A paper describes a structure:
In spite of extensive crystallisation and soaking efforts, no crystal with any substrate bound or any alternative crystal packing forms of the wild-type protein were obtained. Based on a careful analysis of the crystal packing, the key hydrophobic contact stabilising a crystallographic dimer interface shown in Fig. 1b was identified and three protein variants were designed to facilitate alternative packing. The Phe122Tyr variant therefore adopted the closed conformation for the two loops over the binding cleft with glutathione bound in the G-site. Having identified new crystallisation conditions for the Phe122Thr variant, a similar approach was used in screening for the Tyr118Ser AmGSTF1 variant, with the structure determined to a resolution of 2.6 Å. Density was observed again associated with a glutathione molecule in the binding site, although this was refined with a reduced occupancy of 0.7. Interestingly, the Tyr118Ser mutation resulted in the top of the α4 helix becoming disordered, with the weak density observed for residues from Phe122 to Thr131 consistent with considerable flexibility. This suggests that interactions formed by this Tyr118 residue are essential to the structure of this helix and may explain the reduced enzymatic activity associated with the mutation of this residue.
Author numbering:
A (entry chain AAA), B (entry chain AAA): 2 to 216
Write the structure that this text describes.
């Protein structure tokens, strides 16, 4: 059997999961879920995710939610010697995958996402005005985060060490949409961070998932 | 050598780390960091965490930050057959540790923390007024989250299955402080969730870390 990813393909936390499936060479199917008719809150979907949110995943009789959990089960399940992206076979490396995965979720995303969810995902999706207050602020916040990212990505090819990893792939979905805003040119001031970004956009798995993220 | 946890012991993300050390039987030391004199932003501390936040950890020459990453490196490092709390030896079990760990960070904590950080951690720590708006709202939000927790903890002794796990321990630190507010009696309406809470408070490792969380 293939395994099943439930949500719209456009969606960032879907793309986390789909990218991980592409990277690892997995048979998979994407089942839409129609926000506009509350399918995410429908009882079918609540049996996948009791909290009524996308994505959900099913591998036969196993039902998972929370894109990061899904992603890790996919990364351990289809692991090869050729494609170890969580590095659990090395403790110290596995730690620096955890750190930078956690940095994305707790530092970077909370400073980047609100600019995406204001320039792009507010008028084009929800038809809601853009808050210059929240934007100017997360933009200042993100310049300082990219200061730390620059330092790191000047010492290492990737966030976790000198190997692509789950830490890096996590950063792709929301950054992809960042790069569709006027603010994308921000990375031009962070040339190490930029080179690392251009590296990720060069991978056959990313080129593919990128193709799935349009209106 | 022992390993080193940097921040105040009172702090929730310190306690995540310290609890995990106690559970697993590890030699460790807690090095205070004095918020009041900006030690968390001092250059010594920035060499641990470049983002200037607690906790940080050092195991000899390894420097980690982000309590969840720290916690997992501690849980893999000191793992016994007697104390497997991430269950990486079982995929399906490891997935349901990831899910409920992610639920804490993305559903539960964001609905609980703002009541803690308003009734307790605002006037007693920052000397800041309590926002009835934000409280009433996260309280309604949390009642519905505890609906899902009740369902689950009526089917299973613990969040991940019929075994204590990293998912459960994650929920301890902020819930501990929840239980010091007027709102603690909320759990009385969620008797399964309550029994699971009383179970966690009964473990020798939790009784110990609880002792460290006072003014
Ligand atoms: N932490 C989750 C994020 C889930 C999420 O962002 N949920 C959104 C996706 S657009 C949603 O379905 N929100 C609708 C709602 O809960 O009302 C993950 O890692 O997948
Ligand atoms: N996601 C982090 C949370 C870190 C955190 O909450 N930082 C606080 C701890 S009280 C802090 O030091 N804030 C000060 C600042 O960054 O200005 C973890 O898992 O440890």
């Amino acid at each position: 059997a293939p395994v099943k990813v439930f949500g719209p393909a456009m969606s960032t936390n879907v793309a986390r999961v789909t990218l991980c499936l592409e990277e690892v060479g997995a048979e998979y199917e994407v089942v839409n879920i129609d926000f506009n008719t509350m399918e995410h809150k429908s009882p079918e979907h609540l049996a996948r995710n009791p909290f009524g949110q996308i994505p959900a995943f099913q591998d036969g009789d196993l039902l998972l939610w929370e894109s990061r959990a899904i992603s890790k089960y996919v990364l351990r399940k289809y692991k090869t010697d050729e494609v170890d992206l969580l590095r659990e076979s090395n403790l110290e490396e596995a730690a620096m995958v955890d750190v930078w995965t956690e940095v994305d979720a707790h530092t970077y995303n909370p400073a980047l996402s609100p600019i995406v969810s204001q320039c792009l995902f507010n008028p084009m999706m929800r038809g809601l005005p853009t808050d210059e207050k929240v934007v100017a602020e997360s933009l200042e916040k993100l310049k300082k985060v990219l200061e730390v990212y620059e330092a790191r990505l000047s010492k290492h090819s990737y966030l976790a060490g000198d190997f692509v990893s789950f830490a890096d792939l996590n950063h792709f979905p929301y950054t992809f949409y960042f790069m569709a805003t006027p603010h994308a040119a921000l990375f031009d001031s962070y040339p190490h961070v930029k080179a690392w970004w251009d590296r990720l956009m060069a991978r056959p798995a990313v080129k593919k998932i990128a193709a799935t993220m349009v209106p």
